[PDB]
Design a protein around this ligand. Sequence first.
Ligand SMILES: [Cl-]
Ligand SMILES: [Cl-]
Ligand SMILES: [Cl-]
Ligand SMILES: [Cl-]
Ligand SMILES: [Cl-]
Ligand SMILES: [Cl-]
Ligand SMILES: [Cl-]
Ligand SMILES: [Cl-]
Ligand SMILES: [Cl-]
Ligand SMILES: [Cl-]
Ligand SMILES: [Cl-]
Ligand SMILES: [Cl-]
Lengths: 136, 136, 136
Amino acid sequence: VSYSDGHFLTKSGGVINFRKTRVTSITITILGNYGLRVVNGELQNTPLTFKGADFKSSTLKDELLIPLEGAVQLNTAPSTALCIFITTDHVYRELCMMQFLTDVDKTPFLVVLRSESKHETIQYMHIVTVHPFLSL
Amino acid sequence: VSYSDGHFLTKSGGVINFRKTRVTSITITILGNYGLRVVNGELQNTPLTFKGADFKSSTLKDELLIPLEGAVQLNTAPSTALCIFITTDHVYRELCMMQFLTDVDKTPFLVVLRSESKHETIQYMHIVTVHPFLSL
Amino acid sequence: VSYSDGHFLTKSGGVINFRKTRVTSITITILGNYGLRVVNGELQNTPLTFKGADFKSSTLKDELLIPLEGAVQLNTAPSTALCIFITTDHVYRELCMMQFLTDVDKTPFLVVLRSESKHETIQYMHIVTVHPFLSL
Ligand SMILES: [Cl-]
Ligand SMILES: [Cl-]
Ligand SMILES: [Cl-]
Ligand SMILES: [Cl-]
Ligand SMILES: [Cl-]
Ligand SMILES: [Cl-]
Ligand SMILES: [Cl-]
Ligand SMILES: [Cl-]
Ligand SMILES: [Cl-]
Ligand SMILES: [Cl-]
Ligand SMILES: [Cl-]
Ligand SMILES: [Cl-]
């Protein structure tokens, strides 16, 4: 086993940290600096938060693209996440799938796939929890 | 690779069995005594069933806490499950995320995150199937 | 680590290719010939497509069975997928769980579990993306 740490920058200047754990030809990647905790029987959490400005388009479509910048590519299979989308008028709490992909042009992306498009602008997306990311 | 078996007790006296498979610094945990089968082209299943009494609060909130007792901690990333919630008036079939966490006070918990809160009391939660639990 | 390739035939004559990666007693299986890509900032995809004719019953039930034929069994835990169901009147985009199981009679199946039954006939199911399949 070996480990590598890395990060990406979002368009608004946010930093996404990650840690890759390699066991043979499979890698498992976790995102840092967020998650659930139980503190004296009360659930608390720190989400990973994206702004509408971090998306290619801020409309709450059923496919969303977050272009990233950083030193290295990250290419994964999709993983399930619990996300909260804040619009001006609504709060949408939903399971989604997300996947790290690299564009043919070499740009890293995080892609989020949802069930239902809305004609509303994303103010925030909060990732509450996500299954680890697998790469073969 | 090595393997460890364990269990937890729920508040109502239910036993949750699990098996951990360790490969280097990643552990994969499966829960025992439940699942899907196909028998002469017909799907059958044995769910893992929790009572309302097993939850910290039995209200069908969008965050649920199941306090456990047992010999060892179990700390995992979240995994997706298909659950069935039975209330007095309704049956809710839904994908959820669940995660094993340990309280700062050392109490083991199973946490279930859902999309939509209901002002109803849980009679039962049936776990129909769940993706294996990963721990790094 | 070792690798094995295989395939299954569906009732309509479709071929499902898969690749198994074995690391000790855990196997990770990916399905071939489909997935997401980003091409100059635009998301494209090739789904894995099943016909209504591939199911045991074509009704859009909350449990679906796809009987397969091939040289070897494939038995997995459930994984989350984003699927699109096309009926004559509707398009349903949803997260589902799917699992490869073997019948007591030795027939391989792919089983799909959904949240909500509809009294409609499946024309197509498109698998857009699915988390890799784990077997212990
Ligand atoms: Cl952009
Ligand atoms: Cl977008
Ligand atoms: Cl997942
Ligand atoms: Cl808006
Ligand atoms: Cl309690
Ligand atoms: Cl609770
Ligand atoms: Cl999962
Ligand atoms: Cl009630
Ligand atoms: Cl059939
Ligand atoms: Cl069926
Ligand atoms: Cl999954
Ligand atoms: Cl129809």
